[PDB]
Amino acid sequence: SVPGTTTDGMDPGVVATTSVVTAENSSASIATAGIGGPPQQVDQQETWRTNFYYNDVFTWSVADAPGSILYTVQHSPQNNPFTAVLSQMYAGWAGGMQFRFIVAGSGVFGGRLVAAVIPPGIEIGPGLEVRQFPHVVIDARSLEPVTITMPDLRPNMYHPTGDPGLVPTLVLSVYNNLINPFGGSTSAIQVTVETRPSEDFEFVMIRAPSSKTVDSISPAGLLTTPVLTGVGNDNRWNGQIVGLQPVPGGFSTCNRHWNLNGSTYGWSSPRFADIDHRRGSASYPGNNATNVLQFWYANAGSAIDNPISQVAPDGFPDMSFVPFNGPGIPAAGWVGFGAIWNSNSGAPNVTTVQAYELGFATGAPGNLQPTTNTSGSQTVAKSIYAVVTGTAQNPAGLFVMASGVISTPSANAITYTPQPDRIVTTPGTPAAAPVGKNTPIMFASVVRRTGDVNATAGSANGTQYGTGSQPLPVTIGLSLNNYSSALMPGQFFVWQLTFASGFMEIGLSVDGYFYAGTGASTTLIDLTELIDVRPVGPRPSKSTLVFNLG
Amino acid sequence: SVPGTTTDGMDPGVVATTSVVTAENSSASIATAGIGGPPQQVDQQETWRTNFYYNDVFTWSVADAPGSILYTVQHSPQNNPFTAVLSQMYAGWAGGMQFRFIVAGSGVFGGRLVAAVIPPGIEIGPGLEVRQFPHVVIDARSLEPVTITMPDLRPNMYHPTGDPGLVPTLVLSVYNNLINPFGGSTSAIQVTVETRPSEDFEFVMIRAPSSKTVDSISPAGLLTTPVLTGVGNDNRWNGQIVGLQPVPGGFSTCNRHWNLNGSTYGWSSPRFADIDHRRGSASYPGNNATNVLQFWYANAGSAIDNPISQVAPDGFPDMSFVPFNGPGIPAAGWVGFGAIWNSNSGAPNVTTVQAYELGFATGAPGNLQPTTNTSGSQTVAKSIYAVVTGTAQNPAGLFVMASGVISTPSANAITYTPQPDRIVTTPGTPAAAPVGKNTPIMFASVVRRTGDVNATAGSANGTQYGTGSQPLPVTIGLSLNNYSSALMPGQFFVWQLTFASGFMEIGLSVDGYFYAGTGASTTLIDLTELIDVRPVGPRPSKSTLVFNLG
Amino acid sequence: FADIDHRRGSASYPGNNATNVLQFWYANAGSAIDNPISQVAPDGFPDMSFVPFNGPGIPAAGWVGFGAIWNSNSGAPNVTTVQAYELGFATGAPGNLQPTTNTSGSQTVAKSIYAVVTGTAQNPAGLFVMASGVISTPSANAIT
């Protein structure tokens, strides 16, 4: 006898068929994937083919209404961890994949789940009625696993590895409300999804692995475990990422931000080199030239140095200029050490070296006001400390070092200084907006300031944070590879961030912005107990990313 | 007709073979291990190899997330009691070992366990995902036992007892969260692991009893019952350990601290002898050389006679200096009965023998400041009482007894000394951090005070508890042996203290520090009713130690 | 490539007048108790020998990087001591500045290449220099 309480790795449990799984589909799938040649990696006795391996886990609570979606997977060789390795030596794939669900509940629970394979060409999200497709209904009291097969319903004769085309989507939604007849704090059970290729899965043509690599067919390898723990910086301050900042209002970052199409709207390369502009006018107030505040300005659009955009010099911060006058230190400003140099010889001036506040403004000879649009604006520098003399040369130049620190009027730290009310954006960049319970996030790094240059993380004076839209390895890999055929609009590419106590998901839209499903919470995420990052793949944007840190 | 509620000692239950148990692995194991000669203790009728016997027990909480480690053991003869008895009687082994798990839960529980056998080359830590290996799933409502056999996968032809090399590892983690539908106080069940050798297990060479190499006998012998309720002293002072106190936040002690791998980062060999220096200057304030306070200092690095490190003389305490001036005695610190002496075959001076407080200062003899880091500092010593003479020669030195006390001005309740903000550290020290609910602990003792000679544990005011990092018999037994392969890093060697009304588990990490699962409490735990100590062994850091106290 | 931040290194400036002086800073190698990797020098310090210079003469082939002197008791940088500081390793900081290659018995030495008004003479003072560095060249023309 074999009890139902212990299940083998190769045991499928009960096999739950659906009208979408037909012999005609299987025979047509084999017969027309044969245009790739003989099927490859089809040995039935291989260990990667015979066992089920983990794909996901999800929670089913009593508050989950009938029709609400709990699980959604897209047909891919990236669901299985071993067909994802084998796809790096083959140029195509076809066939189906089995999905084994193990429900972890007792015999006292009620409520049921429903499972349908959704054909390609149908939008996946809320309002998709899973119970009016051909479906299967699973109890909460299932002891044995329930494996359903996802066939290859494809309009192409095989899926190329780079662009697969249209694929089905397996949806597990709530059929009936899960009930606990006991009543109390214990109202949730868990369902584990595992996966294994079907008997008619195959790869079709071989190809050299030095062709389109793992970094060009999916953005799974961009956001790996050392990137988010201690190695990757951000794309604004070049500082070690120590957290995530949820932005419930939404923001819009243009500079050093790459979308999933391999394009940018900014004026900066994916690197932190210096800001060097030629022929911008420099000036200094009054008639006396001792301890004066050096000023520099140049119209946006006349920076003919960058092969990416003519708006601003490379590495210029996309922050509005905060106005200040006299010997008063401004609040929340990008300042960076630099100098004024004569354009005719390239020689920097001896005495005009200071920490210059860099930003975007509107009227440089008159009243200095901040701005966000680059149109009709100008890139404006002005030193925050005293400079002896000052170059009043009109064709003069400005050279400012790459990384920047925070201007703070006192020793005490302030909030994260690129707030969305002052981030400079060209006309045309799309904005990150909260979709469902998923709010956009930034990537906080500890950035020191001009009030305490000894201030580190956890300083008793107060810790200072600067935020970026993307990690630098993420936007470095996004500029080098194109992932248009990896995510439709209205979809996220989700990773899982396992922590020491909890676990929580982030997702990347086609715009390039990252999202965590935290709702309206503004509390910074610690990112210190982060142990593991793994990808799970394309998911709907209107499906809440999980977030529990307790 | 056994009903399944009662299991025989020889009964495995349901056998669950994942993918590693194969017939030709067994054949390639048996035939290959004839390089040790004829196999020994291979009689498949002996009761030590036909019955399952107790190995370990572990607790499965409802708070253990999926993927959390519950029970991992490397392949060893030490996983069975009688194989651990015979392993000191033999010098090599090969073959598998069966693991019978018995889950103690009723039919109202839910949740699953997952068990895999990990191949020998794979590193086991935070990034290991166990559900993506060939595995088996076990329900919490398992009545009959489940037996998972780990085979002998090895690149060597056998396993030497002193250096087995690459072994497989059985890893049993949480597949699904444990659920109690009642909720309430009951939030954990227990699983008992029994063990029995496989059909192909054997020993080879005999060797003399107690004679093996690497994987030195696990450090179960350096911490026995008396250490806590009898002999056994501290690291800063020579007193009996009257209790343990948990520090929330962590600490760092690097004076008499030896790590798993035999090494020290600091001075002061583990013996309370005396403090002696030869080079260093003496000075006194005041124009009159009568009723003054002597002032000795030397720089950190003039300890030429110290053979361990140059930064301090041998026996000099790691207490930052408390700056004081006048007839008011300082608050806490390290004073000691000592004297001054001159160099060039010079005996100590008769008229100056006094209690001197020692420490590390910066900016002597002007504004004396306490010092946190050992590098870039200077050692200092000055009298707390009056002495009618002072010497001012440039070569001068101390002679201070090695046992020390704490100088308290009014001396009522006070505070345990030293605090975690008062311990000096060499550069490059490892820092103790709270992992999960486990906090570092630190051993207290009763120490006399200068204000009150009767510092007895009774009436007339509460006592002063002087605190040290690790016990001195542990340091004495661990300064010679090397335990680099005894304990796998990322876990700790846990014991089991048994009081008169409860029990508390104490873990010992690879840094030499001790961990307890008390939580966020600063309550001193009194070792008066402690009876006996029984070792448990290796347990990972994700498991929380128990705190069942009366 | 993060910044160079050292606590308690002595700072000084020559002469008695404090206008357009060359700011100087030095700290013994081995007393940088900030790095969890080695105590020799602060994190990001260049492994280049200090090339000596004096007066208003620009040195040849030196690591220079923009920075400031800050008071250690509060962390506040000074307003006026911001310049391009040459960073290197030397042997005698109060006496004759000579280059060195071995870290043993040497010191990490900073000294600005342009004029600085006033100058902190505080012994426990600190130095904060930005991460990336540029070349010091005595003329417009490049060198090896």
Swiss-Prot record, chain C:
Give the domain of life. Viruses
Compartments annotated for it: namely:
Virion; Host cytoplasm
Q: What does this protein do?
A: Capsid protein VP60 self assembles to form an icosahedral capsid with a T=3 symmetry, about 35 nm in diameter, and consisting of 180 capsid proteins. A smaller form of capsid with a diameter of 23 nm might be capsid proteins assembled as icosahedron with T=1 symmetry. The capsid encapsulate VP2 proteins and genomic or subgenomic RNA. Attaches virion to target cells by binding histo-blood group antigens, inducing endocytosis of the viral particle. Acidification of the endosome induces conformational change of capsid protein thereby injecting virus genomic RNA into host cytoplasm.
Record's protein name: Capsid protein VP60
Subunit architecture = Homomultimer. Interacts with host type II histo-blood group structures antigens at the surface of target cells.
Source species, please?
Answer: Rabbit hemorrhagic disease virus (strain AST89) (Ra/LV/RHDV/AST89/1989/SP)
